[PDB]
Structure formats: structure tokens, C-alpha cells
Amino acid sequence: AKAHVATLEGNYSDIVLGRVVAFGDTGWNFKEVDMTFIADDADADSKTTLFAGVLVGEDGTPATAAAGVFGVLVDRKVLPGVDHYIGVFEPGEKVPMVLAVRGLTLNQLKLKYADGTAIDAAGIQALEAQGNQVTDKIVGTQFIGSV
Amino acid sequence: AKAHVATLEGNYSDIVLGRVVAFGDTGWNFKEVDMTFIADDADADSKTTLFAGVLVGEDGTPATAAAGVFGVLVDRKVLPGVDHYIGVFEPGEKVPMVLAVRGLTLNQLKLKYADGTAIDAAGIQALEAQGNQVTDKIVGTQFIGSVL
Amino acid sequence: AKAHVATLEGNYSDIVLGRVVAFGDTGWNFKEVDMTFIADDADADSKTTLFAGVLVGEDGTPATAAAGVFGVLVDRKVLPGVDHYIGVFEPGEKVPMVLAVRGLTLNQLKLKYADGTAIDAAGIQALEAQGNQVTDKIVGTQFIGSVL
């Protein structure tokens, strides 16, 4: 008897808190690389397990350790509320993804490895090292019950 | 016989010669780290030994070598003439202080290790590798007793 | 049937496609280096072998491998269409040159090593360590005799 329900909370802004806007080149911050969108050996209807905030190395494989951390995936195809991207790609297909590399302020709490685990402290060094600011200073919000 | 005197030389903008104004995140250039303000072992009211321009690592320990250089202490509590913070703290307590990290131009001549010695030619790479321009072309100033 | 003919091809802004300008400094992207202009063997009246887009190390030696790339030489003395410095510097002299290091979007098709060889894929890593973008998405151009 379970009711069919859908949910949506959070936006792209919550991932990219801040950004340096280079006057001479608006694209100075982003590197575009190709990754496997639909998982391999899966049905055309198998929704991809790629989500905003997954760390990916410059090669394109999602990062499972501090070693492979190069950037943050912010592609417009994997933002919250993007649902109808089903079957438009074949298994094992490689399609371009956009990544943010340098000159950004990132939300510490939402960066996650390929498995979804939060970024290790040793991994934060890679992001901090190159361009970016990683900060967990977030206000949060209260909805109901919590006066 | 030792007439009490005080001196002021330099200020905040005399170290951070230039800054890249990040849009949206105005704190893109700075980090906050907890540091031991009053020495762990010292008199209850001994002034802290920290001075502006001292190199500091990621954990807040003053950098004694190029290996531990991460940033430059910039916080307002250590600027010249801010001695009114004496006695407030207690030995062994750690207090946050702002550090400068990236996107800045730094006056080399005022960067010194914890011991007060001048920055090393190897440690300069760490600061420059962070996205900063360490420079030496400073006009300087000359006072009475110099022919101009 | 021989006539004295001269030609000009390019510009300065096709190497540094974009640049981030800092409020504090308009010159924190670059670095000035001491470079040898005329080799120690070629007589005084001979053209220099450098060109805009040659990768150089910090010590001023033109880059020969991906492990030594530090910046791109974009000084205004070697821009295309100048050609008036022949014989002004005797062999072995050392002259300052303006390198471009940080905060740039750099063309790849014009970057080259010491001998003119194109930039290796593993040499892009060194140049992006300074925080720059190496982009190949250049429309190019096509002159008379071509369709479109």
C-alpha cells in the first residue's frame, strides 16, 4: 500500500559555494573529460551511479582513494532532479563530462568517493593543493519541531 | 633610567602587497587554524612569541623548515601595536588564527621562520607553488642620514 | 625574377588566449627571468633562435623535457614582426625576459620545446601544476583558395 513519492532537496549551488570569475576566460576553472556514463554490462535502463560530488581523477575513473583525486564532477547531466536520462547511452559508452578543478570553494560535507564515502582528510590535501578552498563551515537549516 | 618607549614599523598591507579578489567566496585566500597563543610553558602573563609573517604549517605549528611551510600568519591579533591582548589567554590553550594560503603577492623580506631567520631559498617554492608571487622588487624607504 | 618580400602572420593574443587579472596586482601572473639572448658561438650579427611559446625552466634554460617545464616565454622582444635586434647584443650576453606562469589559458598548438617539437602529453601536467589551462579548442582560420 506504499504511496509513490518523489523527493528533491539541494541544488548545484550547494556544491560550488564560490568561484573565481576570470575576466579573460570564463572557462578557466573547468576541465572537460570523458567518462563512462552508463555502467558496463548493464541494461540500457540501468541508471548511472554517477552523482554530483563524486571525485574523479584526471583519467576519468571515479576516485576511491586520495591518490586518484583530481577534481569534482559537476556535470549538468547528474544534478538533482535530472531523471529522464534513461537509455540514451549504451553500456560501456564514453561521453564528455565537465569537471571543476581550480578557483572554487567547495562544500566539505558533500564531496564523496566513488562508493559514496566522505572524502578522507588525506584526500582533502589534493583539492586544497591545486586551486580550491574546501570548507565545512555551513549554517544548516531547521524545519519543524526544532524551535 | 630606562625611559619607557614604544615603536611602530609596518602594518598588514606591508606584507600582503597584492590579493586576488575572489568572487562570491571572499575568504578563498585564507584558512583558519588553531594555534597555541601563549607558550605551553611560560609565565602566566608572558607575551606570545608569534609575529606577523611567520611561516606556519597545516597543523598550526610554526614552520622551522621548508618542509613544514604551508602559510603565513596574518591574523589581527599579532599585528604591531595590538598588545592589548596580553593576559587574556592562559598557557596551553589553542586559539584560531587566520592564515594566508593562495592567490596573493607576498613581500619576501618580511617572511621568516619561527626562529626569526629569513625565509629559505627552498621554502619559497612551497609558497610560490601554492599560487602566490613571492617578490623582491620593493622600492623601500630611506630616512634622515641618507642623501637623496 | 626575385623581389624583396616580407610577411607577417600572427599576434601576441593568440598565445595567451585568456588571463586572470588580480585587483591587488596586474602583474602577479608573470615572472621575470634572466635569459641568454645570443648563443656563445654564433657571431654577433645573427638572429636569435628563441620564439614566442618556447617552454623554459626557472633557471632560464629553454625546456628540453617535460620534467623541466616551468613557464612560457612571451616577452615583447621576440614577438613576430620585430626583427630589429640583430647585432645589438654580443654573443653570451644575458638579458631579462618576461615569462607567463600563473592564471593563464594557454594555446597548445603554439607551445613548443627548445627545438620546436610540440608539447608532450606528460608535459601538460607540469604546466597545469602552476594553475593554467592548456586548450586545443581553437577555431583556426582558412584563407583564399579554400571553400567556405
UniProtKB/TrEMBL annotation, chain A:
Superkingdom is Viruses
What is the designated name of this protein?
A: Head stabilization/decoration protein
